[PDB]
Design a protein around this nucleic acid. Sequence first.
RNA 1: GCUGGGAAGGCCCGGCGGGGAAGGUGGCUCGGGGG
RNA 2: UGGGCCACUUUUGGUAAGCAGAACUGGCGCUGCGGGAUGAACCGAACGCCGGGUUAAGGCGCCCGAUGCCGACGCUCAUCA
RNA 3: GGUUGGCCUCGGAUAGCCGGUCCCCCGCCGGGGUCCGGUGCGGAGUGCCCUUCGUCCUGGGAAACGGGGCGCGGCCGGAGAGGCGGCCGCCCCCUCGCCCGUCACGCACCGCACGUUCGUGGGGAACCUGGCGCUAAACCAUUCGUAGACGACCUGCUUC
Lengths: 100, 201, 139, 51, 125, 109
Amino acid sequence: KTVFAEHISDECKRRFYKNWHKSKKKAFTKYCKKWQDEDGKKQLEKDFSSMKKYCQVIRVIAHTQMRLLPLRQKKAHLMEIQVNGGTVAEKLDWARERLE
Amino acid sequence: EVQVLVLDGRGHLLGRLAAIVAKQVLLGRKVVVVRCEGINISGNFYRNKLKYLAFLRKRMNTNPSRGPYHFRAPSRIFWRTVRGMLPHKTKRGQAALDRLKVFDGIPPPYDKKKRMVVPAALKVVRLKPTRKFAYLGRLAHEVGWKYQAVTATLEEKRKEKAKIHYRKKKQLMRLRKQAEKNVEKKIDKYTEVLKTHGLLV
Amino acid sequence: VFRRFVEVGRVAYVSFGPHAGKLVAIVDVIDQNRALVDGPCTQVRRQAMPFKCMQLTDFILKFPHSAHQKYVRQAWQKADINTKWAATRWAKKIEARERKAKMTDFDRFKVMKAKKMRNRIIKNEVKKLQKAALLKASP
Amino acid sequence: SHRKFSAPRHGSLGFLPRKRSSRHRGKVKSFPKDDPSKPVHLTAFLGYKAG
Amino acid sequence: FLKQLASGLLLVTGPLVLNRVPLRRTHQKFVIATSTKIDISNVKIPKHLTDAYFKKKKLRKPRHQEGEIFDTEKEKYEITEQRKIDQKAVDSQILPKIKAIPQLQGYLRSVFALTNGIYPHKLVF
Amino acid sequence: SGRLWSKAIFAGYKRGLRNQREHTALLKIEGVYARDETEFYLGKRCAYVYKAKNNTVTPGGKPNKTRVIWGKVTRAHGNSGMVRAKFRSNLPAKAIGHRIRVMLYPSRI
RNA sequence: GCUGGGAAGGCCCGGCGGGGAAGGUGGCUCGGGGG
RNA sequence: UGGGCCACUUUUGGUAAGCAGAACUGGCGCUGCGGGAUGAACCGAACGCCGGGUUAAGGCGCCCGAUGCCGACGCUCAUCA
RNA sequence: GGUUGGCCUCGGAUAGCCGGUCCCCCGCCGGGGUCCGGUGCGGAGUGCCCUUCGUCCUGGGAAACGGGGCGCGGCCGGAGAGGCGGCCGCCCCCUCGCCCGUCACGCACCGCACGUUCGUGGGGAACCUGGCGCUAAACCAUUCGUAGACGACCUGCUUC
Ligand SMILES: [Mg+2]
Ligand SMILES: [Mg+2]
Ligand SMILES: [Mg+2]
Ligand SMILES: [Mg+2]
Ligand SMILES: [Mg+2]
Ligand SMILES: [Mg+2]
Ligand SMILES: [Mg+2]
Ligand SMILES: [Mg+2]
Ligand SMILES: [Mg+2]
Ligand SMILES: [Mg+2]
């Protein structure tokens, strides 16, 4: 299971597009509402609980910040970084508090 | 027949079970073999490992990527043994090979079903007790299989769930025997018919 | 661990071969594969018989080895193995199998009806027992 | 017949498909083995070669 | 089963009130003889129940040559009141003997089928 | 209301190793695994029933897509309960591993 | 039908017996056991 | 047509040869078919176009027809069987 | 185009097994130790379950704390490929369906095949009919040069 945060940056959202210029930037705009409606919040809690109960290794999706670089590129780089050192519940709590 | 024949691979000899399975799938039957890591091979472990290492040595000298593919999972090893007994280069043989599914451990589709056994392929009846044998799971693990540990943990988890199910089934059967001795005046009339015709000694 | 042995006097049930379904008594042993065998009251004249077609029962007669059929028959009739055998669970399982095999179409129909009624009554009582045992309110 | 003098082969067959990489980012392919006794930590990062 | 007719066809009547089989002919090659029987001795089959009695009736195109006006009428075979009389006559003395032995009427009401476990070569009929 | 035919599998043609006599077929009848058990089925009618694309006339019914090739059991084959069958037209090779029905029609019991 | 006009075998506790023993019954002796 | 070759056995030269040379019969050449996985010669058997039955030599775990016999007696463990 | 009831599961041993029960420990259920049965497996896959002609009069038994809901709503379990299963609450129905009987009826189509199921099967378009919803990208062209024979690849293009 993959759970994304609310308020994903535009530089990260550019990674999801081949042509951000012609894009209408709709990425995650329907997913982000589930962090605020009640049913979506319940579903997110169930996703986290099932990850605790069934997952052995968790990773965080993290992206670089392009606007701080002197490069031409504005599209961020995304990667999964493994969370080591603890129980699955501990590393999920750590990742949850590190979201955004 | 018309149903899927699910066989439990534990305690079965590789080639014997493969011959039976190959004939079944050539007769249009759908066969599923589970727990391929429990399959046995006659002869001691070092000898069978040497056979597999000699198989590993056979690769195309010009391009090993084109050469023979040595599959390391026990399920794939057994599948290849069955393919050796099928005419897999014809359409009929390929359909027969498609009617076969092999698994390491018992996945959730078939872990809730009853598993058959092939006595003509069982080690207990086919092999003298003084003879040595190798475990397909150990042989696969030592020739390159990577999931012996996780399959073992999942299998023990499955066995715990199965033990709980069996305890419930025994409770139900005890309750059925108690019910049978409870409603007996209203049952002995049909019990007599069954006893007369040889059901229900 | 073993409870049944091949010995002089041991009664064996013949499972296959020309004399399948009968009882015999072991009179002597030859060459680890065969026995001298004599059922004088079960219509098996004395002859060699492989141990592979024998299934040892729990009855043991008392006579010396290679004694004549007269003495084997006297030992069989005294403490009559025919009635004792017919009383065992083994023999009536065999009998049930035989009379189930000779079941006719009409008998199959009647068995189906009787089994239908019997199973419905038994499962109703099972449901009653489960419901009664579900009334648990205890610390 | 055998080659007259011995010489080691050129290049390594361990990097054998000398093709353009299918990715630009560079993937980890093996994270450090996880032991739960240690504190919770991240195992990787992304940087840019300045010079 | 009642009797064999002059052409070798069997005359049967699983009584019409039990399984909707009238006085009918059948071929012994295409029947299975079961081991259950009833003593139908002393019942009187009417003498006129013959092959000529049971032979089919038809009449088409005597005066009709080109088929454009449909002859598809009379295709509804009608049960003759004579056949009803004979059916009642035979059943009125067959049924009392069927009710004599327990649950034979239900056996005659049911049909034969092959269950996925049972095999006709092993069945005793 | 019920099956009324034994299930058989079209195993293949009567053959040597490298020759094939397509005019006769071998059938594996369910539950028949000895040669002494095949006596019941000798002479019994057997049918290979299949479906096609065009409609064909059905005796005692309206046309449907079901077609049939009729045949009969001729003798026993081997020791393991296989039987031989002669069909009116040689069975197509696509039927190997598929269902034949043995209908009990010319019964001798 | 033939055979060694089959060989064995069953029953008549086969009866008057004679003899041979052992893969040794009872008994006796010795050594380990259950009230 | 007048290049022959092969096999059992006899046999000469040669260390030997899928070598060279003889005798006898059969074969291949000129010949398909069943079996020997494969194969000019080995084993069976020789051939008009078919149906049924049965065999030969050879086989009957699966490829692949046939042992899916409750086959009989033994021998044998090989980290190159 | 197939197919022509289902089986919803202990682990295993094999010079051994299976089941049941009373005392001790594990927070009321299992694990031991007794004890009692079974073992050519009968708590048996050579097994078990379901069992289909349909109705109408009409009795006796079983039940009556019962059955059927593509009716709703909720809860619980299942992650190895969970693609599945179970439990509650309200409501709407017949007191019927299961066994033995009474009672007659249905096209009884005049001997005949592909009948009988899965099945409301899978896939593809198209028409009508209601409710609830959505309003996007990819590629080219341009640009970049972390790339490059050409393709391909990395990039940018009205916002603070
Ligand atoms: Mg020469
Ligand atoms: Mg020439
Ligand atoms: Mg010639
Ligand atoms: Mg020739
Ligand atoms: Mg050949
Ligand atoms: Mg060879
Ligand atoms: Mg021929
Ligand atoms: Mg061969
Ligand atoms: Mg075969
Ligand atoms: Mg050697």
